[PDB]
Design a binder for these strands. Structure first.
Lengths: 229, 215
RNA sequence: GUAUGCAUAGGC
């Protein structure tokens, strides 16, 4: 029941400013050391800052120092990361994490971060928000058949895809998005299913691009080749 | 000055049941305050070890860690298909609390051949004046593979992009997706669209094609 | 090298 949730990520222009929120449940932030850790695309983890709300003590990594400050709101039981003068290199997933302030955390070494948030993506770019188009990949190998959606020309990341409202999980692969020469993202989500089931069962692509408020349900079915009817 | 955690190797591959050791060295004395984390792709890191030796609640017995001096070691006793991840150390001794650059652990398994599929463009896409053709390589191993598009025997280069999934944490396999993009005009000016797949589990390359305006 | 809970918080 202890949890941390990030909010406030999204597209921001170079030099602009952003405010991330880390919202705590099942504990008071005053009892814990709240940290921010960020990971740039295909990069390792980087420790950036922390606050201890009881003392009010803070520290900032050089990379963010003077452009970023952190604040605690005990009323909202939330920590905020105020990011200013954002740069392209600041583009990353931003995690809040904690360690509990325990006798052991002080006199001894138990500092490891026990609870993390899910992350929030911060994209620092001049480019403009644009929603995807969704195209079917229609099944025509062995006793199995493959089908999917092609989610094309969107920006920024992310896009989430589920199948039959999340009922269909096994069989699914959603591929890492690719950046095209246009500057827009494309990805495909594929599912292998028994070929026996193409008549019977419905297959629906559920596509969500939160930055542009675009949600699409795409029903994928094999194409029909007659033409004599 | 800031403490550096130098973690090695950058990456490793090992089979199921093997013992794996990842090591990390502090550039200065961190006095035993070291944690180890497991990060699955696209997901929050999970705490494994928190002092140089202590096991966090709920973490499996196969994970252990130990310290000699500034040298720190994480040990997986018998590698499991669920153990695929990147593994990071960190020091809590002095701010900033620095991470090692990480170690990605791939799990070896027996060679498997890609099941190949090919997807012609939708009609819907076509009216936008673009044609995307997708070639799917599903559930294979090892990760190296090759996809080559041919349009009426003309080899296509510079007009495609591919993406590979992270190793599956059950079957330890991979999946690949390749997209060939064309103007509709160029699409409707040709007939045979094919993708040829080269991999080890294939004794000979596989080709999967379609003809434009076919069904 | 032990309590990722509490707590004027350098104590329980």
């Amino acid at each position: 029941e202890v949890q941390l949730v990030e909010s406030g990520g999204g597209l921001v222009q170079p030099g602009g400013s952003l405010r991330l929120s880390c919202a705590a449940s099942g504990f008071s932030i005053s009892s814990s050391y709240i940290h921010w850790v960020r990971q740039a695309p295909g990069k390792g983890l980087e420790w950036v800052a922390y606050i201890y709300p009881y003392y009010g003590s803070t520290y900032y990594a050089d990379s963010v120092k003077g452009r970023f400050t952190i604040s605690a709101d005990t009323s909202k039981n939330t920590a905020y990361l105020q990011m200013n003068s954002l740069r392209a290199e600041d583009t990353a997933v931003y995690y809040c994490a904690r360690y509990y302030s325990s006798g052991g955390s002080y006199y001894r070494y138990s500092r490891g971060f026990d609870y993390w948030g899910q992350g929030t993506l911060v994209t620092v770019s001049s480019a403009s928000t644009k929603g995807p188009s969704v195209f079917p990949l229609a099944p025509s190998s062995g006793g199995t058949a493959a089908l999917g959606c092609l989610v094309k020309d969107y920006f920024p990341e992310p896009v989430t895809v589920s199948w039959n409202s999340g009922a269909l999980t096994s069989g699914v692969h959603t591929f890492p998005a690719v950046l095209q020469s246009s500057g827009l993202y494309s990805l495909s989500s594929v599912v292998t299913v028994p070929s026996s089931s193409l008549g019977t069962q419905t297959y629906i692509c559920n596509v969500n691009h939160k930055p542009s408020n675009t949600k699409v349900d795409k029903k994928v079915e094999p194409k029909s080749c007659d033409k004599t009817h | 000055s800031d403490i550096q955690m130098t973690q090695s190797p950058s990456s490793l591959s090992a089979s199921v049941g093997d013992r794996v050791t990842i090591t990390c060295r502090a550039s200065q004395s961190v006095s035993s305050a070291v944690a180890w984390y497991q990060q699955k792709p696209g997901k929050a890191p999970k705490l494994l070890i928190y002092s140089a030796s202590s096991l966090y609640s709920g973490v499996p017995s196969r994970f252990s860690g130990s310290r000699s001096g500034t040298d720190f070691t994480l040990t997986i006793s018998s590698l499991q298909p669920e153990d695929f991840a990147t593994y990071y150390c960190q020091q809590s001794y002095s701010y900033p609390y620095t991470f090692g650059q990480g170690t990605k652990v791939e799990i070896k398994r027996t060679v498997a051949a890609p099941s190949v599929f090919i997807f012609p463009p939708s009609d819907s896409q076509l009216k936008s004046g673009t044609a995307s053709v997708v070639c799917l390589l599903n559930n294979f191993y090892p990760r190296e593979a090759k996809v080559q598009w041919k349009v009426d025997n003309a080899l296509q280069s510079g007009n495609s992009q591919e993406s590979v999934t992270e190793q599956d944490s059950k079957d330890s396999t991979y999946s690949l997706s390749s997209t060939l993009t064309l103007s509709k005009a160029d699409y409707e000016k040709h007939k045979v669209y094919a993708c040829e797949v080269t991999h080890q589990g294939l004794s000979s390359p596989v080709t999967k094609s379609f003809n434009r305006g076919e069904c």
